[PDB]
Write a protein that binds this ligand. Structure first.
Ligand SMILES: CCCCCCCCCCCCCCCCCC(=O)OC[C@H](COP(=O)([O-])OCC(O)COP(=O)([O-])OC[C@@H](COC(=O)CCCCCCCCCCCCCCCCC)OC(=O)CCCCCCCCCCCCCCCCC)OC(=O)CCCCCCCCCCCCCCCCC
Ligand SMILES: CCCCCCCCCCCCCCCCCC(=O)OC[C@H](COP(=O)([O-])OCC(O)COP(=O)([O-])OC[C@@H](COC(=O)CCCCCCCCCCCCCCCCC)OC(=O)CCCCCCCCCCCCCCCCC)OC(=O)CCCCCCCCCCCCCCCCC
Ligand SMILES: CCCCCCCCCCCCCCCCCC(=O)OC[C@H](COP(=O)([O-])OCC(O)COP(=O)([O-])OC[C@@H](COC(=O)CCCCCCCCCCCCCCCCC)OC(=O)CCCCCCCCCCCCCCCCC)OC(=O)CCCCCCCCCCCCCCCCC
Ligand SMILES: CCCCCCCCCCCCCCCCCC(=O)OC[C@H](COP(=O)([O-])OCC(O)COP(=O)([O-])OC[C@@H](COC(=O)CCCCCCCCCCCCCCCCC)OC(=O)CCCCCCCCCCCCCCCCC)OC(=O)CCCCCCCCCCCCCCCCC
Ligand SMILES: CCCCCCCCCCCCCCCCCC(=O)OC[C@H](COP(=O)([O-])OCC(O)COP(=O)([O-])OC[C@@H](COC(=O)CCCCCCCCCCCCCCCCC)OC(=O)CCCCCCCCCCCCCCCCC)OC(=O)CCCCCCCCCCCCCCCCC
Ligand code: HEM
Ligand code: HEM
Ligand SMILES: COc1cc2[nH]c(C)c(-c3ccc(Oc4ccc(OC(F)(F)F)cc4)cc3)c(=O)c2cc1Cl
Ligand SMILES: [Mg+2]
Lengths: 33, 96, 192, 360, 282, 205, 74
């Protein structure tokens, strides 16, 4: 938010989440679908 | 450290370098207080530990019972059931 | 002018939101779908009776016994490291601030000794929301500041004035601006 | 630098209700020191040449005065490094310390990976059967990544050139770790430490002498237990096959790594796919890193107190601990269909508990 | 500005200013405006007066008959406090959104305290008048007077007279008034003192406004505005909410005493002033 | 500061009140404002025109002074030797300097026909000036000599071509040369890391 | 008037959308840095690829060095 310089951790958060959604979606299509 | 509205100092003398961390965590004593402390050279310092032993032990052991012991007993049981099925499975395949 | 074309798409979606915005309070729409709100209501009499119900009741008993052992209120568990709660604490009147200070001191001492309070000192309701009026005013103040000043990613001079240049205002709080001086006796930002 | 020493180790103020759960950071640091001292001393008489490495360790024990003491202390202390770290990390998950000590948590995770890599490099140096065949296997799980293997070895197989370079890396990485410990402490003292109750409080006292004497008491226990195990051999921390010379054309009957790598080695063993097993490795680390941003994952304001006291639903960290113990048992067993079935049962708990920690 | 719909850019690129870009549809036959003052009044007693000269920048002003001559020994400094709290939080708008929205509109606004009158004013493009009216009237209709906002204004409250000391002409004038009308009416000071800080709380302020800030004691004036449009928006500002009710007050006559006062200060010149009373005033 | 002075007694370097080293002839003004008149009525050597080194003014200081074994430099002025309890009284009739300990611990300032408060007012350091002060000590008007060039000779003025394209092609060329040097050093480091020529051959059978 | 106050309140309703427009502006200024860093990456891994591939990325321009050694056997 306005007033602080914590500017990299919000980027790390969005990359980690996206990476998890892709790992567990690539495994289901191989086992289930 | 402390919030800005607590870090504000009443005095004006400069903060010395060996005390930088002390004043980064200043906190206002809202309402005030009165403190009494005795010198360690004039106290019994081992008897108080044993005087309160039973009360302290009850508090700690009671807190840990449900959360730690109950899942541990279940894990122990699963370890035995696992080892009982391994033996029976070896004889149903290799023994005549 | 490739930037002006992208700006036209943003603007079209923007005007659509505005043209469909109501001018008075309207209840929010249900989140869960009708298929999910039908299974829950059908299994409710059995799921609630034997599982969810006792889970809720055990939770409140566990919380109440821990707080009462230490003489604490539920709202004493929030930290002043949250910006919203820090602003709320600044708005308190003296009498409420003094009682919180005292309860926090007493609870740290009791947790150090690991000794329960007597039962007659535990006869109180710990779930009274004494911070609520100040929390809701704090949220209003900080939401205004963010909408009026923090709507864009602003540029700045890098590693100048004790800060990094990417948004921080208080100096020396990131490693690449650590160790401000090699000589001297230093100083406090609170004494500038 | 003496004003920094007195500001951070003498006059630093701490909450009165600290206890031994807050002493294991100091113990880990002291284990690094002991390893650096004993490691350098061993280096004066070690030979990286593959044809003579195994013999140089034995000659060191059998002929050199006090050679047995430095060899056995270095091996035992390595086990205590990982036990302390495990207790250190578990305290954080019990108290949700990463809520506001965000960069302290992330920096710690980097230190953990550095220590894992260091230990793996050191275990290959004595150049016994388990040295060779454990490196061959663990370096094949990384085969899905293209060309990440033949270069680290500098050959077509774990040859004599790999041993020379594992010695240099093993020498260097610990000192890099010492640099990152400084960052770790920077991010901690920026915010200040938490306490077991999870509350803010003004009942604090100076580090010296009250809190400094608790660290000292724990150090005594550590030194006594290390020497007890080192000089008498009560537990079996090393595998016997590493007392056998390397043979490239004879695989040992049972290949198992050190205990502190067993659990995740079991997880990767019950998953048949080789590519899917490595994705499982990344997802677990990603989950631990994401906890640094737990405040933002839900709009409800969180609290540090998790209310495990007298609670019959327990907590996710406790359930994880028992799943890890269960897998250490599976990893140490001979492959059998029944072991594989239960190993998969525990793997689900091992992974699901991590994911749900991000929910509240 | 979330994107932009127009994509034509600067259509006058490359054309120098010695050449005109207007079209015949932009030409008109001039018709002079209504430059005489027009008068109107609302039902709550507010008097309104406006005039139009055909300019594009308008001036707006709200005059209140509540100056320092109405203060007493328990109130000295209250009118100066109200001036420094102008454009603070109201029932329907916060301090930050009020001052930030005026700036973004390109307007200037302020509050000036005097011995007989208080004035709130703003200047802006004449199409923004309806937006500026509520931000002027809100100060006298429903101010909140929040504690933490009073505590943030206490600094600038003392720096006024301190800045006045190094302004000789303004200091000679103050000394002339304090000495001409000793301890009464026109002799009260304009700004606060360290003593005034003993009664700087919302209850004292709100009690002063309830005696003097009724609509009957106020006039609104605009220049370069349409009279009828100004009346409509002023009516809409007062229709849904209750204003301070009227009150009968007796105005004390000033008592002229004369006298003498000196004030030594480092300076190369000797400033001297001598005056007499004018009976009846305006 | 971290530097200490070295004021101590010395048996070989006698005190300046007894061996001054510097030329010990000074004038004395009743009030230092009078030096402004000396500066406008005395002539300066730097206002005369000379052309040869042989015509330069000769110093009044003597070259024969400091002596000793392996003493390379032979002329000095000041020293930190401690002054004794009863120093030598300066002889003002010969032009000797009176300052510091030689004012406080001697009777050099007594005048029979003046009050003491008046006499001692003339013995502050600003009251004394060495002979030759007005004729010699320079006071420059600039750092630059008119016999030397400055930017007026080298400036590119109207009608000149723009230099920006050349300045940045100079710097860019240095960088694409330095980038190539770095890329080559890294490629050589990676090769060294890879298998050697003796092991590549053993694999072929 | 209540109508005026309503329009001022709504002026900042689309905070989330405006932050997204900020994302676009900044990422458009940053993304060109991928070209310098991309050239250097290919420049580094070029010599580790087969000869046949090295001649394809350059359209037959690149060829083996001719330093006067390892010639055909009679
Ligand atoms: C000093 C006083 C005492 C006396 C004097 C002492 C003198 C000595 C002191 C030193 C003096 C010399 C100067 C040294 C300078 C060093 C540089 C420095 O200071 O930078 C600080 C600088 C922070 O600066 P700042 O001013 O504090 O804030 C910056 C912003 O303004 C604001 O940013 P922010 O606050 O918003 O967020 C900051 C955050 C930003 O956080 C991040 O961006 C995350 C960084 C960590 C990521 C990895 C952690 C694990 C995550 C999960 C796994 C992910 C896998 C990858 C896949 C992801 C999905 C695609 O950073 C941190 O949390 C700090 C972490 C500390 C990193 C330090 C590492 C330095 C380089 C050396 C690395 C060596 C690694 C060996 C171990 C591995 C060996 C195999 O840190 C960085 O930003 C650099 C990050 C580097 C990350 C390297 C990660 C390597 C490992 C990756 C995982 C690989 C796994 C592979 C497994 C394979 C298995 C087979
Ligand atoms: C299993 C291993 C672990 C160790 C054994 C188990 C643990 C307990 C052992 C017994 C020690 C405590 C004895 C009672 C308390 C004494 C202090 C006191 O205040 O008492 C009077 C106090 C009432 O007196 P008062 O009139 O109110 O106040 C009088 C004082 O002025 C009050 O003044 P104050 O409060 O300020 O303090 C007075 C002060 C003054 O005390 C004195 O009287 C001064 C004594 C000077 C000597 C200090 C001891 C040094 C010994 C070192 C070893 C020998 C070195 C010599 C060479 C040996 C060569 C072979 O007291 C001390 O300094 C205590 C000294 C004794 C320390 C404990 C030593 C135990 C180990 C001994 C052998 C060494 C380890 C083995 C290694 C070597 C062999 C391989 O009563 C109590 O405190 C309540 C007593 C009930 C508590 C005892 C509960 C025992 C059962 C629980 C443990 C069961 C086993 C473990 C279960 C958990 C694991 C499964
Ligand atoms: C005389 C005849 C002979 C008999 C006598 C005895 C003879 C032998 C010799 C004498 C022996 C006694 C001598 C006197 C001793 C005096 C000192 C003393 O009492 O020490 C206790 C004292 C306790 O500290 P405290 O300040 O009093 O209280 C701290 C609170 O408890 C902290 O609580 P909090 O609430 O503040 O923090 C919350 C949370 C925060 O979290 C933490 O603090 C960290 C995590 C704590 C939990 C640790 C477990 C998780 C790690 C698992 C590791 C897995 C290993 C992998 C390998 C597996 C291989 C299969 O911590 C906890 O939750 C802690 C409670 C844990 C309870 C565990 C319950 C287990 C239930 C088991 C059920 C089993 C069911 C199945 C049964 C089947 C059969 C029927 O600790 C020390 O003073 C430490 C000194 C040594 C330092 C360590 C150096 C060695 C490192 C290796 C050992 C690591 C563990 C060490 C303990 C760690 C404690 C945190
Ligand atoms: C049976 C055989 C026995 C053989 C053993 C020897 C027997 C000798 C018996 C002689 C008896 C008759 C003569 C008695 C004289 C007594 C003088 C005396 O005590 O002083 C009285 C008296 C003391 O009164 P004072 O008040 O102390 O006055 C002192 C002055 O103020 C002083 O201060 P100042 O300010 O007046 O003077 C300026 C000062 C300051 O001047 C400077 O700083 C200027 C320097 C400019 C240098 C520029 C150089 C540039 C060119 C460089 C070329 C390239 C070189 C680098 C490349 C190298 C590549 C490898 O100049 C100096 O410091 C002069 C330096 C002289 C250095 C000569 C050292 C010779 C050593 C020979 C070896 C000894 C053994 C060594 C150890 C062997 C292993 C154990 O002194 C005078 O009046 C002045 C007299 C000075 C005489 C000096 C020369 C004496 C030579 C005697 C003969 C030696 C023969 C050796 C060979 C024999 C072969 C058979
Ligand atoms: C006014 C002032 C004027 C002044 C005078 C004039 C000034 C200028 C004169 C200059 C004269 C020359 C001077 C000498 C320079 C060269 C010599 C030299 O330097 O050599 C290096 C020298 C020896 O060089 P070397 O290694 O023998 O050279 C071997 C060759 O590199 C052999 O390399 P290779 O065979 O391995 O690989 C070569 C290969 C390499 O190929 C590749 O890697 C890639 C090839 C495939 C590219 C595929 C591209 C696909 C896309 C195409 C797009 C087309 C678009 C078309 C559009 C059309 C529109 C109409 O290239 C080719 O095959 C040829 C390329 C043909 C294809 C055409 C395309 C080219 C790429 C174009 C990219 C795009 C450009 C435009 C971008 C912007 C617009 C988008 O090394 C040293 O001296 C080393 C000394 C030690 C250094 C120590 C450094 C420090 C150590 C300590 C470090 C630690 C401390 C840190 C210190 C840090 C300090 C900073
Ligand atoms: C955290 C720090 C360290 C850890 C965890 C560690 C771990 C290990 C381990 C597990 C071994 C194999 C022991 C065996 O089974 O024989 C080993 C061996 C060795 N380490 Fe360390 N080490 C550390 C630091 C160092 C340092 C700093 C050096 C040298 C500067 C060093 C030098 C050696 C040598 C020469 C050996 C081979 C001797 C042997 O295998 O007994 N170590 N290390
Ligand atoms: C070489 C490895 C490490 C060293 C030397 C080290 C050192 C320390 C020390 C001395 C403390 C303060 C005292 C204490 O709380 O015990 C501390 C606190 C802390 N460490 Fe570590 N640490 C290491 C690894 C880790 C790891 C692996 C993590 C987590 C993944 C971590 C996370 C934390 C956190 C969150 C705290 C603050 C705890 C709190 O105040 O609530 N550290 N560390
Ligand atoms: C909820 O509480 C926790 C969760 C935890 N989750 C995880 C995923 C880990 C962890 C991280 C890295 C790691 O590194 C590895 C080494 C070696 C390998 O491979 C092989 F084969 F074992 F050598 C794989 C991997 C091994 C294990 C923990 O420590 C951990 C600790 C606690 Cl308390
Ligand atoms: Mg949250």
């Amino acid at each position: 938010s306005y007033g602080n310089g914590t500017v990299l951790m919000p980027i790390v958060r969005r990359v980690f989440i996206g990476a998890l959604v892709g790992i567990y979606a690539y495994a289901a299509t191989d086992v289930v679908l | 450290g402390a919030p800005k509205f607590e870090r504000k100092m009443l005095g004006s003398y400069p903060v010395s370098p060996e005390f930088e961390m002390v004043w980064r965590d200043r906190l206002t004593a809202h309402g005030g207080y009165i403190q009494q402390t005795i010198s360690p050279y004039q106290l019994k310092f081992i008897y108080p530990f044993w005087h309160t032993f039973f009360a302290r032990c009850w508090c700690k052991c009671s807190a840990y019972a449900w959360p730690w012991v109950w899942p541990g007993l279940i894990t122990f049981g699963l370890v035995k059931k696992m080892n009982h099925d391994v033996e029976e499975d070896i004889r149903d395949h290799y023994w005549y | 002018q490739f930037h002006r074309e992208i700006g036209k798409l943003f603007a079209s979606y923007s005007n659509k939101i505005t043209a469909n915005s109501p001018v008075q309070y309207v209840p929010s729409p249900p989140t869960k779908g009708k298929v999910r709100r039908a299974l829950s209501s059908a299994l409710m009499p059995v799921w609630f009776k034997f599982f969810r119900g006792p889970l809720d009741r055990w939770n409140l008993a566990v919380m109440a016994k821990y707080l009462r052992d230490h003489g604490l209120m539920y709202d004493d568990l929030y930290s002043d490291k949250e910006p919203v709660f820090a602003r709320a604490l600044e708005l308190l009147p003296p009498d409420i601030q003094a009682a919180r200070f005292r309860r926090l001191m007493r609870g740290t001492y009791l947790n150090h000794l690991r000794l329960y309070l007597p039962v007659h000192e535990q006869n109180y309701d710990p779930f009274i929301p004494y911070m609520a009026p100040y929390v809701e005013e704090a949220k209003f103040q900080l939401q205004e500041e963010e909408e009026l000043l923090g709507y864009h990613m602003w540029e700045g001079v890098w590693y100048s004035g004790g800060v990094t240049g990417f948004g921080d205002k208080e100096p020396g709080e990131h490693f690449l601006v650590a160790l401000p001086n090699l000589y001297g006796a230093g100083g406090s930002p609170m004494q500038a | 630098f003496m004003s920094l020493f007195r500001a951070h180790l003498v006059f630093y103020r701490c909450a009165l209700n600290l206890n031994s759960s807050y002493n294991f950071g100091f113990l880990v640091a002291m284990t690094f020191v002991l390893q650096i001292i004993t490691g350098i001393t061993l280096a004066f008489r070690y030979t990286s040449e593959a044809s003579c490495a195994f013999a140089s360790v034995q000659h060191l024990v059998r002929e050199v005065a006090a050679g047995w003491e430095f060899r056995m202390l270095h091996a035992t202390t390595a086990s205590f490094v990982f036990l302390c770290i495990l207790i250190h990390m578990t305290r954080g998950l019990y108290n949700w310390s990463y809520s506001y000590l965000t960069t302290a948590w992330m920096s710690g995770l980097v230190l953990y990976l550095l220590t894992i890599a260091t230990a793996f490099l050191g275990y290959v140096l004595p150049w016994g059967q388990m040295s060779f065949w454990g490196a061959t296997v663990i370096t094949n799980l990384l085969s899905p990544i293209p060309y990440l293997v033949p270069w680290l070895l500098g050959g077509y197989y774990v040859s004599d050139v790999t041993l020379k370079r594992f010695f240099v890396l093993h020498f260097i990485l610990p000192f890099i770790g010492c640099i990152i410990i400084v960052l770790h402490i920077f991010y901690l003292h920026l915010n200040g430490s938490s306490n077991p109750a999870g509350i803010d409080t003004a009942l604090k006292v100076a580090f010296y002498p009250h809190m400094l004497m608790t660290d000292a008491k724990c150090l005594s226990y550590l030194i006594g237990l290390i020497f007890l195990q080192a000089a008498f051999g009560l537990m079996e921390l090393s595998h016997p096959d590493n007392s056998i010379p390397v043979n490239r054309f004879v695989t040992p009957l049972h290949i198992v790594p050190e205990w502190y790598f067993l659990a995740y080695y079991a997880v990767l063993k019950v998953i048949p796919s080789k590519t899917g097993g490595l994705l499982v490795f990344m997802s677990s680390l990603i989950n631990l890193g994401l906890l640094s941003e737990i405040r933002a994952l839900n709009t409800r304001m969180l609290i540090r107190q998790q209310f495990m006291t007298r609670n019959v639903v327990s907590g996710w960290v406790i359930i994880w601990v028992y799943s890890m113990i269960f897998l250490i048992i599976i990893g140490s067993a001979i492959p059998q269909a029944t072991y594989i079935l239960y190993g998969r049962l525990a793997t689900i708990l091992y992974l699901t508990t991590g994911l749900v920690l991000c929910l509240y | 500005y979330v994107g932009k719909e127009n994509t034509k850019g600067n259509v006058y690129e490359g054309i120098p200013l010695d050449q005109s870009i207007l079209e015949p549809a932009d030409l008109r036959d001039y018709v002079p405006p209504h430059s005489n003052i027009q008068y109107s009044k609302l039902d709550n007693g507010l008097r309104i007066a406006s005039m139009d000269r055909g300019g594009l920048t308008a001036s707006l002003g709200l005059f209140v008959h509540a100056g320092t001559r109405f203060e007493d020994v328990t109130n000295f400094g209250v009118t100066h406090m109200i001036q420094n709290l102008a454009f603070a939080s109201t029932a329907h708008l916060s301090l930050l959104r009020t001052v930030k929205t005026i700036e973004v509109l390109g307007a200037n606004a302020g509050c000036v305290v005097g011995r007989e009158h208080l004035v709130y004013s703003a200047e802006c493009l004449r199409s923004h008048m309806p937006l500026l009216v509520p931000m002027l009237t809100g100060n006298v209709l429903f101010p909140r007077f929040l504690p933490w906002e009073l505590k943030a204004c206490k600094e600038k409250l003392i720096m006024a007279r301190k800045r006045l000391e190094h302004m000789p002409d303004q200091m000679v004038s103050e000394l002339l008034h304090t000495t001409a009308w000793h301890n009464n009416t026109l002799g009260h000071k304009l700004h606060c003192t360290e003593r005034s800080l003993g009664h700087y709380n919302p209850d004292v302020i709100r009690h002063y406004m309830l005696q003097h800030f009724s609509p009957e004691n106020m006039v609104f004036v605009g220049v370069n505005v349409n009279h009828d449009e100004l009346c409509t928006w002023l009516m809409r500002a007062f229709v849904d909410y209750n204003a301070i009710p009227p009150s009968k007050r007796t105005v004390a006559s000033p008592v002229y005493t004369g006298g003498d006062v000196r004030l030594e200060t480092p300076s190369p010149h000797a400033h001297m002033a001598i005056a007499f009373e004018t009976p009846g005033g305006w | 500061s971290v530097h200490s002075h070295n004021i101590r007694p010395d048996k070989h370097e006698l005190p300046a009140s007894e061996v001054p080293l510097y030329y010990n002839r000074f004038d004395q003004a009743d009030h230092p404002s009078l030096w402004q008149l000396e500066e406008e009525q005395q002539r300066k050597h730097l206002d005369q025109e000379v052309t040869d080194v042989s015509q330069l003014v000769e110093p009044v200081s003597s070259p024969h002074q400091t002596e000793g074994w392996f003493k390379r430099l032979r002329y000095w002025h000041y020293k930190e030797t401690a002054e004794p309890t009863f120093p030598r009284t300066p002889d003002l009739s010969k032009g000797e300097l009176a300052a510091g300990a030689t004012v406080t611990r001697t009777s050099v300032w007594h005048d029979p026909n003046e009050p003491a408060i008046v006499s001692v007012s003339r013995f502050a350091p600003d009251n004394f000036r060495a002979v030759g002060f007005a004729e010699n000590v320079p006071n420059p008007e600039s750092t630059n000599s008119d016999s030397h060039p400055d930017f007026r000779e080298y400036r590119l003025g109207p009608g000149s071509v723009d230099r920006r394209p050349f300045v940045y092609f100079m710097s860019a060329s240095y960088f694409f040369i330095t980038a190539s040097m770095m890329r080559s050093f890294l490629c050589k480091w990676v090769h060294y890391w890879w298998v050697s020529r003796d092991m590549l051959a053993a694999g072929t059978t | 008037s209540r109508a005026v106050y309503a329009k001022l309140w709504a002026s900042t309703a689309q905070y989330t959308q405006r932050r997204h427009y900020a994302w676009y502006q900044i990422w458009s200024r940053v993304i060109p840095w991928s070209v310098p860093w991309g050239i250097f990456a290919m420049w580094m891994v070029f010599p580790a690829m087969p000869v046949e591939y090295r001649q394809a990325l350059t359209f037959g321009i690149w060829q083996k060095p001719n330093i006067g050694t390892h010639g055909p056997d009679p």
